[PDB]
Ligand binder design. Structure first.
Ligand SMILES: *[C@@H]1O[C@H](CO[C@H]2O[C@@H](C)[C@@H](O)[C@@H](O)[C@@H]2O)[C@@H](O[C@@H]2O[C@H](CO)[C@@H](O)[C@H](O)[C@H]2NC(C)=O)[C@H](O)[C@H]1NC(C)=O
Ligand SMILES: *[C@@H]1O[C@H](CO[C@H]2O[C@@H](C)[C@@H](O)[C@@H](O)[C@@H]2O)[C@@H](O[C@@H]2O[C@H](CO)[C@@H](O)[C@H](O)[C@H]2NC(C)=O)[C@H](O)[C@H]1NC(C)=O
Ligand SMILES: *[C@@H]1O[C@H](CO[C@H]2O[C@@H](C)[C@@H](O)[C@@H](O)[C@@H]2O)[C@@H](O[C@@H]2O[C@H](CO)[C@@H](O)[C@H](O)[C@H]2NC(C)=O)[C@H](O)[C@H]1NC(C)=O
Ligand code: K
Ligand code: K
Ligand code: K
Ligand code: NA
Lengths: 376, 376, 376
């Protein structure tokens, strides 16, 4: 007969038995503080200190680092080993008189990152009497305690999965969003045309045009680099700004200082009688990894297989997560049955050093597994 | 003086005269159950069974089926009727010595679908005493009854109108999202380059390169198929997973098992005094279709013209919908006047067998009209 | 010790001391009216007229006007000054016999606009007794008064920054959304291929193909205009409809009549004891501009530097905005310190005549500054 479920983050309340509601739209890039002494209706000399601190909205973006975009010049040469053979990016036609194209005057202009996942959050700290609790609350999730609920509801449409972020300088400060960075076909002149994915090695663009032998060679395709073409119409692209940036491997976090954006905050307080925590349950979970497949740094992602032991309940509807170092990369909602369970969790993100663990709530397995590299 | 309006789905309440509030963030891919006996404040022996069941979030996507994407090999031949003339996809230059390109070793690799409309919903069932009511509630809509309101608020940014969904296998399980599938220009090498829209008939890609007569012909454009180019950088594309998929003509429904996504649920209950239903009204509507124009399976859509009779009110602000088989494809907000009204409803989606009806609430006209086919 | 903050738009309430809550999902394209006489619990003969009017959702889009898209025919000519030299858009090869391509039969087919910023709002008017106040409330913001709070929460995903809107006719009524309008590379056949940014002057597309001398010239690249290619697959593109359109320089406002879209409205009323306004503060701000850099009509945007004087508080967490004529284009959240402050505000949008002012709340500096033109 029981059907325990902890996927509901929130409370049941009797509106007569609640003491304070705060409900407001908050600038995303602003913190908020509330301090009050809760006092009994003139009846008694017993007061409770309430102290709420909501931190500025943070964005966390799981990315694949694409390396550096380059500017360069396309050079045409006529011969009759090509004189230009040491150039990494080249194109040739033999007449049997050799025509060649090669890229030179290469210069890195920026660092590019492919967006895999976008998540917004606020750190929320609540002191109620001698209780003090801080939690990072995802947008569209809730902080739940015995006497205080804090829910954050919002929407942002600035970034999308698949977008490519370009940072030109030591770009704290800001960057550009590209919605059409070249992937499966890179032609000279495209955004993303000339890349170096790591220290060495260029991924060269295609040169779709034709040679002509005139004996002076000509090439009739585009001769302008993607960097120059983008700069020539730079106002066509969307900038964004950043503050207190934190790059880690395959992840970027920052606070967006765009003060036109807002989210909704609801705070409900009950002074005497505790809230009914809708996720309360007696079920106990043990976790370990079994296997993994797929890749980090990949829009396709990975799948972590977990062995999950349920005791103290016949069944338990919950979520098993793939996490490492308190960042979670995936979750699977599942009705567990008493005893052993096998649960597959699909995730995306992470880096070569990530060990993806099976987690429930704030509890994780003792070890995690490494996923494979992308773009092999 | 009256200005009746049923476009508000919700209730007016006196917060002193409400008995229970449930407010929580729910994993999108999870159901939720609440069961309680509502009992009078120790005053009386009269209790009310409350039973709420909220089903997992479902996505419904109106699509245009694009048929199958193919892999193939581009073959070059020299002649001096072309030997390769039976190939459906070809390109030739005459020297007067004929150079030809043709596609062969064709193989379907997946089924593609263009997104026209995305909508999320949850089925919500409420029993209050001997009252039992179930309704499919769209995200950002509300379940309204005399004693219980259930509102769902949320946002998802995974899919967008215009995206193309590719299913490789018998793909329940999952697929890929393409944001740049070729439409007005398909060149060999693009995602979507080689399509068969129906059983027979290829839509061939362009071959933008040039022939050279060397006498051996050469072609200096791209020789790698779109499938191979995409597979070579597959980690650049976004996967999604599915569960309990339901394909119908020009529509796909499933439950997304991504447990990182959440939505917000608010449940308000009044035990004694009924809620004020904000859409309550005495107005009565009769409906029939008059005409239609435009297309099913189309991002441009159709327009259904309805003849709508209003009685028992001088005016009535409401919505007239275009629906068939309990799926709605469009709605027009309108202030009707007593007597006959002509209302145009813009819609998108549906298939060749759809008969789009004029509807108000859960009431529809006796017949609907067929829209025209797209891509003629 | 004080930490004043007006970035919270909302109220603190005691749920026992609140008299009425309205909570509902409203058709976006519908207005809503509520009228009630608030009367004391049978105790007294003193009533309060409440009158709330919520107007239909409006979209406001800051854009860059791109001018007109054209259809045309690509003509091939052989010579042996080119006979076709007066054509603005042309391409030639000399054999030393001259081959030329030129565009002719040009006709404007529509007006194009690049989306820079999208914002939705509703005008909300509240009369409570002899108090009457109207305000334009942004989606995800709140109307706050002593006795009434109105919050709007919603999400829409129809338009995105970077999209290009095309209006074919005198297009009130509607238009098309393009997600891939050509920017840094325009080739003949692309959406956006042939543009005239202003009265005169074409921005000509590239012709990526090759000439051949056969002596009759041939050109082996695409010969079909972007307009014809898009029309041939028009159902692949997304239409939208409009009502009561208002074009101004670099801005379009309208009401979207799509009645499938909804947003959430919450109205809270307290009859006796005032709400605690969470943004209440004694701080006083003076403002003037100092300098500006960057551009109007640009996805990259501008930065307005403001000199902001704070008195009556040691510190004040607030937002400084860049606005003109009651439209705001940017905001910066900032903790001001007593005395003079320098605050940089990043913004986007506006036009050549805009004078961007430093603003706080509904108060603005006496003059604003002009930003520079885009696309120089
Ligand atoms: C969720 O989706 C993953 C992803 O794999 C799928 O990706 C789609 C884009 C499409 O290409 C489809 O053909 C492909 O299977 C599924 O994982 C995959 O499962 C297959 C079959 O067991 C394995 O051969 C793959 O190695 C495996 N890949 C990864 C990265 O795990 C997964 O089955 C599916 N369901 C769940 C519950 O995660
Ligand atoms: C809502 O928009 C439709 C769509 O038609 C418009 O589509 C735009 C993309 C653009 O191309 C514009 O030029 C075009 O009119 C409107 O319906 C169309 O109306 C015209 C004029 O009466 C008819 O000739 C078309 O056949 C008709 N098409 C369809 C599919 O109905 C419609 O008028 C507009 N308004 C409403 C209230 O629906
Ligand atoms: C917010 O971003 C703007 C935009 O400028 C940046 O745009 C990025 C897309 C990228 O190209 C980056 O290299 C570039 O700086 C910043 O304004 C710029 O600041 C620099 C340095 O002072 C000036 O040289 C520019 O003229 C200036 N441009 C504009 C339009 O103002 C700005 O510093 C940054 N921070 C804030 C708080 O606005
Ligand atoms: K080539
Ligand atoms: K060609
Ligand atoms: K060319
Ligand atoms: Na060529």
């Amino acid at each position: 007969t029981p059907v325990w479920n902890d996927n509901a983050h929130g409370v049941g309340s009797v509106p007569m038995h609640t003491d304070l509601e705060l409900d407001f739209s908050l600038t995303s890039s602003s913190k908020y503080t509330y301090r009050r002494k809760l006092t009994n209706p003139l009846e008694e000399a017993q007061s409770i200190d309430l102290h709420i601190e909501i931190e500025e909205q943070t964005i966390g973006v799981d990315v694949h680092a694409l390396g550096h975009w380059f500017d360069g010049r396309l050079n045409l040469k006529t011969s009759f080993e090509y004189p230009w053979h040491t150039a990494k990016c080249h194109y040739e036609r033999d007449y049997q008189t050799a025509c060649g194209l090669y890229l030179d005057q290469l210069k890195p202009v920026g660092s590019a990152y492919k967006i895999i996942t976008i998540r917004y959050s606020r750190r929320v700290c609540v002191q109620f009497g001698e209780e003090n609790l801080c939690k990072i609350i995802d947008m569209n999730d809730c902080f739940v305690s015995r006497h205080v609920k804090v829910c954050i509801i919002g929407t942002v449409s600035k970034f999308s999965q698949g977008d490519t972020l370009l940072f030109f300088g030591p770009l704290e400060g800001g960057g550009l969003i590209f919605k059409h960075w070249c992937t499966s076909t890179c032609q000279f002149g495209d955004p993303g045309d000339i890349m170096s994915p790591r220290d060495k090695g260029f991924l060269c663009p295609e040169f779709p045009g034709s040679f002509r032998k005139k004996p002076i060679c000509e090439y009739d395709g585009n001769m302008v680099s993607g960097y120059k073409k983008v700069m020539a119409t730079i106002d066509s692209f969307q900038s964004f700004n950043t503050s207190t940036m934190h790059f880690t491997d395959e992840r970027i976090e920052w606070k967006d200082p765009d003060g036109m954006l807002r989210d909704h905050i609801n705070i409900l307080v009950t002074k005497d009688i505790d809230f009914d925590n809708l996720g309360e349950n007696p079920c106990k979970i043990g976790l370990q990894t079994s296997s993994i497949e797929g890749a980090w740094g990949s829009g396709v992602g990975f799948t972590l297989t977990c062995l999950v032991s349920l005791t103290e309940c016949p069944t338990f509807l919950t979520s098993i997560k793939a996490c490492d170092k308190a960042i979670c990369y995936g979750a699977e909602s599942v009705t567990l049955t008493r005893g052993q369970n096998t649960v597959k969790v699909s995730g995306k993100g992470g880096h070569s050093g990530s060990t993806f663990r099976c987690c429930h709530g704030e509890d994780c397995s003792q070890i995690g597994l490494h996923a494979a590299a992308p773009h092999l």
